[PDB]
Amino acid sequence: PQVTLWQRPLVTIKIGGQLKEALLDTGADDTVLEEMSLPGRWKPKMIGGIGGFIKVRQYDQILIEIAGHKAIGTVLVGPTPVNIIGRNLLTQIGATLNF
Amino acid sequence: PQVTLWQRPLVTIKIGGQLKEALLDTGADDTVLEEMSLPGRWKPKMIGGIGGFIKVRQYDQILIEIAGHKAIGTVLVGPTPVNIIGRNLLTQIGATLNF
Numbered sequence: 001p002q003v004t005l006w007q008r009p010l011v012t013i014k015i016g017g018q019l020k021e022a023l024l025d026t027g028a029d030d031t032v033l034e035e036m037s038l039p040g041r042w043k044p045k046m047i048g049g050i051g052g053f054i055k056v057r058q059y060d061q062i063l064i065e066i067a068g069h070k071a072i073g074t075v076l077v078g079p080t081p082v083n084i085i086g087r088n089l090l091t092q093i094g095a096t097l098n099f
Numbered sequence: 100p101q102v103t104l105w106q107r108p109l110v111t112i113k114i115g116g117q118l119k120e121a122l123l124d125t126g127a128d129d130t131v132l133e134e135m136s137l138p139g140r141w142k143p144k145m146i147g148g149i150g151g152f153i154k155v156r157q158y159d160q161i162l163i164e165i166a167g168h169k170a171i172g173t174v175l176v177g178p179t180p181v182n183i184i185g186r187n188l189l190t191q192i193g194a195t196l197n198f
């Protein structure tokens with residue numbers, strides 16, 4: 001779709017068999033989701049945002065369906081204010097900004 | 100134009116005659132700029148992201164040119180690593196996210 005920005009660009013995602021809501025976030029390099037259980041092995045990682053840094057669990061090669069589009073890639077899990085879909089997966093679903 | 104998300108979607112902006120680089124950010128409600136001295140009244144604000152909150156100065160009705168597209172509205176100024184163009188101004192330049 002063509003997503004306008006008068007409201008937050010929130011979409012439904014499916015991950016680990018669960019439906020969740022996430023923010024399409026062009027300002028994020030990486031995808032970060034709120035605390036949840038995910039199948040594979042994970043590695044401790046750090047990521048930083050506007051307020052500083054947090055500890056996350058890094059899961060590699062995870063399937064996520066984003067508004068009906070499949071991506072398979074790295075998902076970080078930790079204390080984020082909201083689920084955010086970053087460029088690592090936005091690129092997989094062919095997303096661009098235009099104006 | 101069509102901005103790719105292979106890299107950070109940075110574009111040139113102009114505010115108060117100053118030329119800067121900023122992120123076109125669908126995940127930001129508001130526009131946040133790196134610390135700079137602006138004249139005029141402002142209002143204290145706190146905004147939150149992945150590391151917690153930071154204190155910013157809120158300036159209203161500020162003119163900002165984004166990749167040659169003029170916009171006017173609220174700008175937040177504080178200790179951010181990067182200049183962030185949020186939805187309050189992205190909507191004014193007719194930006195959409197497409198996939």
Ligand SMILES: COc1ccc(S(=O)(=O)N(CC(C)C)C[C@@H](O)[C@H](Cc2ccc(OC)c(Cl)c2)NC(=O)O[C@H]2CO[C@H]3OCC[C@H]32)cc1
Nearest residue numbers: 027028029030048049050126127128129146147148149180
């Ligand atoms: C009320 O107005 C606002 C409120 C919050 C923000 S936010 O910057 O925290 N953020 C919100 C989001 C986390 C829910 C916008 C987001 O795009 C942010 C911008 C940024 C903030 C700080 C930055 O430098 C550390 C950068 Cl490069 C982008 N990106 C972000 O936190 O991304 C994380 C996940 O991927 C990595 O890549 C960039 C940072 C890491 C902006 C405006």
